[PDB]
Amino acid sequence: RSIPLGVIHNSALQVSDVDKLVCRDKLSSTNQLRSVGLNLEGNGVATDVPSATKRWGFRSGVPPKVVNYEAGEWAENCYNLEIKKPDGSECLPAAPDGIRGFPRCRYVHKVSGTGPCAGDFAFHKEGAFFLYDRLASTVIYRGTTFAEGVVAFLILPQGYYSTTIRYQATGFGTNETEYLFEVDNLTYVQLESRFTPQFLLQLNETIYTSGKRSNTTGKLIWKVNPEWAFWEXXXXX
Amino acid sequence: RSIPLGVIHNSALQVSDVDKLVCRDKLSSTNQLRSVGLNLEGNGVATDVPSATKRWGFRSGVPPKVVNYEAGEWAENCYNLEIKKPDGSECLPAAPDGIRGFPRCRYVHKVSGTGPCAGDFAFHKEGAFFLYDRLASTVIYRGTTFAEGVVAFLILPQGYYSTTIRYQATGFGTNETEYLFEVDNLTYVQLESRFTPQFLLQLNETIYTSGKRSNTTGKLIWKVNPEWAFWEXXXXX
Amino acid sequence: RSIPLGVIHNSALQVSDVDKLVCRDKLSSTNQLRSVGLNLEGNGVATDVPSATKRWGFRSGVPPKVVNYEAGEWAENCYNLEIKKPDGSECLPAAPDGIRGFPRCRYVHKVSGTGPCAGDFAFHKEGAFFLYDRLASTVIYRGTTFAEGVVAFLILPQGYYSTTIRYQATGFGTNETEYLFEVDNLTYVQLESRFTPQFLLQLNETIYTSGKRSNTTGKLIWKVNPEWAFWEXXXXX
Amino acid sequence: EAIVNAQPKCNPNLHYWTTQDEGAAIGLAWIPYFGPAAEGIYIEGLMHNQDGLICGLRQLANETTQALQLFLRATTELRTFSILNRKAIDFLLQRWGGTCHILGPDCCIEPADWTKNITDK
Amino acid sequence: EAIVNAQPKCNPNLHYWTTQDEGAAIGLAWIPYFGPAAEGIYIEGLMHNQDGLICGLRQLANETTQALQLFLRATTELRTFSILNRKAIDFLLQRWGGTCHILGPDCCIEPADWTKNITDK
Amino acid sequence: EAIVNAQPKCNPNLHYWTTQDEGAAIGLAWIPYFGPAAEGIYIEGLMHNQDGLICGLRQLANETTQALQLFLRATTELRTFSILNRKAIDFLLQRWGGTCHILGPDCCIEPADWTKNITDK
Numbered sequence A, B, C: 001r002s003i004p005l006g007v008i009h010n011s012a013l014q015v016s017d018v019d020k021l022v023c024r025d026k027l028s029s030t031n032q033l034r035s036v037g038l039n040l041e042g043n044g045v046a047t048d049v050p051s052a053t054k055r056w057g058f059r060s061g062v063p064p065k066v067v068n069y070e071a072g073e074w075a076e077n078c079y080n081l082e083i084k085k086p087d088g089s090e091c092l093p094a095a096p097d098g099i100r101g102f103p104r105c106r107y108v109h110k111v112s113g114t115g116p117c118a119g120d121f122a123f124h125k126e127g128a129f130f131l132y133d134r135l136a137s138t139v140i141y142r143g144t145t146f147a148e149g150v151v152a153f154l155i156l157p158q159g160y161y162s163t164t165i166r167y168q169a170t171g172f173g174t175n176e177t178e179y180l181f182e183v184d185n186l187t188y189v190q191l192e193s194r195f196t197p198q199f200l201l202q203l204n205e206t207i208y209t210s211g212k213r214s215n216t217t218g219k220l221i222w223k224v225n226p227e228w229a230f231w232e233x234x235x236x237x
Numbered sequence D, E, F: 001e002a003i004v005n006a007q008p009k010c011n012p013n014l015h016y017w018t019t020q021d022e023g024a025a026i027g028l029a030w031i032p033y034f035g036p037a038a039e040g041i042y043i044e045g046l047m048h049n050q051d052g053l054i055c056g057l058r059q060l061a062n063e064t065t066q067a068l069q070l071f072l073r074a075t076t077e078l079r080t081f082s083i084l085n086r087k088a089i090d091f092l093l094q095r096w097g098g099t100c101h102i103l104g105p106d107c108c109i110e111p112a113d114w115t116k117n118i119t120d121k
Ligand SMILES: *[C@@H]1O[C@H](CO)[C@@H](O[C@@H]2O[C@H](CO)[C@@H](O[C@@H]3O[C@H](CO[C@H]4O[C@H](CO)[C@@H](O)[C@H](O)[C@@H]4O)[C@@H](O)[C@H](O)[C@@H]3O)[C@H](O)[C@H]2NC(C)=O)[C@H](O)[C@H]1NC(C)=O
Pocket: A043, A125, A126, A127, A128, A150, F006, F007, F008, F062, F063, F065
């Protein structure tokens, strides 16, 4: 059937039945209709970078599509990708004119690195959208901050802080992807799924203050010994 | 007057009179309105490449215009042009983003070659449209398959095989245009209007199986001795 | 509140009150609604180039916006800017596809030269629009003729000659801008605000016929001794 | 006015292609990543010349061309998608854009049942 | 509210240009290939200040600017063509977006002729 | 049909951002040149799970995805802004797209006051 439209009846939200007509329903101006976007975050999906990237994939033959939405949710986690093939060619297209990043992100997970990118565009494997500034797209644009989400349409009844977290990635978009969390351009930490955004920032500050940054010209990589929703080489132990 | 709208009255199609109002006419959703595109083919126009190209011409000062249509007709003949000036500059513009070729063509007549192209865009001399994938344009795009057609708007009452035929052309878009049908990159047949698509394919297969392809490094050109709608040098005799 | 809509009541134009409903108001087709554009000229604003350019300024962080309008006013003064930074990089963006110049201008003031251009786009400091061919923009496009104006929306009740005037400018968009009126590529006149378009054309014709153009290879610049709305070095005295 | 086909020939059969927005998707094929490519989003059908509608349609699209071209000359929009929606709006305004005088020729209100409900009293 | 022109001056004559979608085309000039160039698609007219409408229009466009700018800030659309159509929709919804209570102030149904047709019986 | 949230979790609080077209501008901030940058055009709000509306909304957007994706597959438009306007048009056509038979189930005309005005006579 057609695109569902949400309405409030009997102190509950419901989908309006097109086949039946309710004359008590009053629509007095187009201002009473709204499109809203809701974040996958809010349904309990894992938001760590290894888990989130496994939901995206490259595909050819399918033209991208964009739909607008008027209101959105403050996100805890957004993503921003700069992925090249091993030969240095870009994997994601430049943001089209008028598509800016998602406007409210507590943590922006910026991921750089390489992968095969066996497809013209990167889609959401579960059918969700990539949410930008009041535009929802079926594909990922290069270096543009997005939140994962879905769109709803409604009949209405008649400070801000952001912190970037940088990662390096090899084999992006595959079964065997490697992720490093970046402390400086020469100090990295082996990323795991269990590492929450707050834990990575503390790990960064403790590495800076304890002098565990690389004091050579080469690349230093740490591993961390093993020692709920957000709203509710070497070693180190 | 305004754009006509087709409707069914008395077991016949008619144009709706705007000046008069029919309350028995019922329009219950926008799904009852459709834009359709119909092929010039279906009116009996000659579809051979020499005849069809004589209907197109180059013109400056007129901005191109595109209108969408929701449903189309399976075409027997479509066209796809790669025309350069003698200096090697392109005559037709690159297909804009989102304009793909006409989706159902039995025979695609791909024409390459040169011509003066004395105009910024190629229009239809009879006012018809170039039909692409659910978009109708007033101009020809480069290397993009189109059918000639016209658009209608309606109130509704309440395998696939494609074969490319390649031609070379000199003096495209003029009174004295030369066309060659391509067998391989070195074997050509002097094209005439009477040659139907089916006859060219048989001519190609018989040339391949009888060994009449060029067995040198140079260009071989055959002429064929002289020896109804579709729905109803050297010589060879 | 919302965008005002003009309507004729009691032999006078008024804004329609959204909060009140007038059943005597009849809207029988979308043809009864029109968007129109009116020229700042018509309100008495100074139209000399020094005065007009002081109303425009460069700003970053604000995306440009375009709205269409269906009918416009014949302008006496339009403008067309080719401004580069001192390093030779363009200050204004290329006209987007489909944005042509304002269609009726008695005098087009074409200004070339340099300035700091401390911003991504040039906006109207008073909130007005730049009027192009049936498109109104919040920003100035490069080398595209525009008139300053504002847009109205309405419910309707149920030869052409153009002359270009060329100027050179240094320090465009600043408190201390210098303007020269161009006679030929080597003869200029120090521009002042009081010089109307008609007076500049007479000054050009008298310089050509009296032989006061430069007869060397170098730049000649004249100053003119000091010796109402439009609808109602060296010296020279 | 009535439709008079005046073309040299008429293909009386219409072998057509289109899309459907309310496609009853099977499993996960509605997901763009898994769905069909651009070439496979089409449905097909065949319609014959009952009531002469096919020949009428060909004539109708021919006669639409002039009005449609003049509309596209006058618009600044590069690609027009709004024609059908604007015709739905004009349909409503022709009927409900003014005061509806019951039992008038330009007011589509049937008062019969309310007139009969008054007769029973 | 009424329109109070408060500009330093007012050109009382309006020499205007526009297009027409229903242009009565002569011969083959509707065909884009043969039709006028971009510069020649315009008609012209002249309107004087009867009922003070011209000065009113200049004031009206001035007062529209603030509301119109705030609308364009809030949209993501690069070029807006939908304002007038949306106002036609809002016109209909203001009148027909709810149950129409006959003889009420927000229901534009004239029942006079049906009331007189009842009186004759 | 009713909305059955069937997600593994539900954030019951909705901390949202949006814009406003009728912003009561102070002084000259409506002028683009002087107004806020792209990052500062937003208002914020917080809505709790009274009547379970928040959890319902999350479920509603999830269930909209299939129908919405199939609509975007079938359109040629690169960016769609017309969905809500088209739903307002369909709202009107469902009610006023045919002859309105008073006291019928598909006609939203209340004749009570005109029926009582007839009783007084
Ligand atoms: C709307 O909400 C729905 C419900 O929340 C979302 O449904 C999700 O749909 C995707 C596929 O599109 C599912 O992913 C699949 O998961 C299975 C099995 O998951 C693994 O975990 C289970 C335990 O949960 C375990 O028992 C299994 O052994 C698996 O290891 C995989 O086999 C598939 O390959 C695929 O990845 C989600 O699981 C499913 N979520 C739920 C909660 O059922 C739907 O995606 C939402 N729509 C949008 C547009 O967001």
